[PDB]
Amino acid sequence: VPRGSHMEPLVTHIYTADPSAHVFDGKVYIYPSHDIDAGTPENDMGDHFDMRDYHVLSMNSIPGEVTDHGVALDIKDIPWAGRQLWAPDAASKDGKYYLYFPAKDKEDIFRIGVAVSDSPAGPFKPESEPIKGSYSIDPAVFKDDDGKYYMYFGGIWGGQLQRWTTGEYAGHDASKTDLEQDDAPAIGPRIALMSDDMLSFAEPVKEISIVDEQGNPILGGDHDRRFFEAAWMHKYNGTYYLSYSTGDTHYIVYATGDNPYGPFTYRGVILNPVIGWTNHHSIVEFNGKWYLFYHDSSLSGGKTHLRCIKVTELTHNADGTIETISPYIE
Ligand SMILES: O[C@@H]1[C@@H](O)[C@H](O[C@@H]2CO[C@@H](O)[C@H](O)[C@H]2O)OC[C@H]1O
Ligand SMILES: O[C@@H]1[C@@H](O)[C@H](O[C@@H]2CO[C@@H](O)[C@H](O)[C@H]2O)OC[C@H]1O
Ligand SMILES: O[C@@H]1[C@@H](O)[C@@H](O)OC[C@H]1O
Ligand SMILES: O[C@@H]1[C@@H](O)[C@H](O)OC[C@H]1O
Numbered sequence: 393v394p395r396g397s398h399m400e401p402l403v404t405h406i407y408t409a410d411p412s413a414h415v416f417d418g419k420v421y422i423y424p425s426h427d428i429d430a431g432t433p434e435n436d437m438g439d440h441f442d443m444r445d446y447h448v449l450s451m452n453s454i455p456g457e458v459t460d461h462g463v464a465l466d467i468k469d470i471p472w473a474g475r476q477l478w479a480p481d482a483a484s485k486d487g488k489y490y491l492y493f494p495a496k497d498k499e500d501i502f503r504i505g506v507a508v509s510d511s512p513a514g515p516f517k518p519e520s521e522p523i524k525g526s527y528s529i530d531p532a533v534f535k536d537d538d539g540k541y542y543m544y545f546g547g548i549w550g551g552q553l554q555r556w557t558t559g560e561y562a563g564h565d566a567s568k569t570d571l572e573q574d575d576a577p578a579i580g581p582r583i584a585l586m587s588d589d590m591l592s593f594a595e596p597v598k599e600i601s602i603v604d605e606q607g608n609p610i611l612g613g614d615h616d617r618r619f620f621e622a623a624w625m626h627k628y629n630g631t632y633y634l635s636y637s638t639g640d641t642h643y644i645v646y647a648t649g650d651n652p653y654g655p656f657t658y659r660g661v662i663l664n665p666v667i668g669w670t671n672h673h674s675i676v677e678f679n680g681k682w683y684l685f686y687h688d689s690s691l692s693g694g695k696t697h698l699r700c701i702k703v704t705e706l707t708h709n710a711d712g713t714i715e716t717i718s719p720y721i722e
């Protein structure tokens with residue numbers, strides 16, 4: 393049956409989260425996390441998010457029937473990965489499809505790996521090792537209009553980004569949150585140009601600067617605006633839009649810049665807080681309309697780790713601003 397007309401769950405037979413939506417072959421393909429009721433201990437490092445595989449979803453229209461293409465990748469087949477298949481993304485280049493995924497390696501360190509298919513629906517064969525120089529979580533692989541592909545990534549707290557300032561992992565006993573210096577600039581998300589073959593980074597990883605409207609860095613203490621997780625990049629009318637989750641303040645916000653690397657100027661809220669702790673999204677143009685894919689914990693009766701993806705129309709104004717969406721109003 394058709395789904396996605398009035399912010400209802402897109403699928404109900406499985407729990408789904410962290411939707412990355414793309415238009416491939418004239419269809420919407422969605423690459424979400426597959427939540428399961430693992431019953432794992434709940435804590436601020438996210439051990440309760442104990443996902444083990446990915447299913448690719450697709451829609452021919454919005455609203456439309458949602459097709460579940462089965463298991464696209466299983467953690468047991470990823471040689472380097474020990475646990476926790478977190479928020480993924482996909483990209484398409486030269487008739488190959490690449491699934492990018494964060495997972496903990498055997499030393500309990502989040503890394504980002506790639507898996508390869510000849511179809512947007514998968515299934516995907518994982519590379520034996522993670523991407524060299526990757527770390528932390530929540531990849532978004534963005535194809536610019538010039539044909540260059542960039543990976544945006546990172547997440548603080550359980551995502552471990554705060555343990556990666558020196559090019560070496562700071563360790564299990566290092567900060568569980570951030571820099572713990574609230575008057576210093578907040579930690580920024582990471583970016584790297586992708587290699588031609590889409591399996592590696594083409595440059596040393598860079599940090600993205602996010603600034604306020606006056607050009608001042610967003611500070612570590614500014615939890616309403618500072619980067620937490622779920623980076624996403626889209627382009628509209630020549631402007632680059634870095635959107636992301638603020639985590640403990642539960643917003644999707646956005647910041648604008650003139651190139652992939654920023655700096656990005658904080659503009660405002662994309663999505664207000666949902667049911668359940670996490671907030672995670674993507675923004676995609678399909679048939680000349682823009683859509684916000686997101687999730688909440690409505691289907692599970694409010695369990696933070698059992699989510700369902702949803703979609704709604706997103707409105708850009710011609711001045712580049714985006715209308716804030718509140719999830720439970722209309
Ligand atoms: O030190 C402990 C780690 O060993 C543990 O990390 C897990 C080990 O098994 C691997 O298969 C997983 O990838 C990895 O996360 O986490 C708990 C910590 O106390
Ligand atoms: O890495 C992130 C975790 O740090 C995050 O943990 C949340 C912190 O606040 C607690 O009240 C929540 O229960 C807990 O989920 O979860 C999201 C994950 O990406
Ligand atoms: O990596 C994902 C993160 O962005 C958040 O949503 O919680 C854990 C995962 O779902
Ligand atoms: O957002 C800006 C704020 O960070 C600064 O402190 O005062 C001016 C505001 O526009």
Ligand SMILES: [Ca+2]
Pocket residue numbers: 410411412479480481530531532622623624673
């Ligand atoms: Ca994402």
Ligand code: NA
Pocket residue numbers: 660661714715716
């Ligand atoms: Na707004």
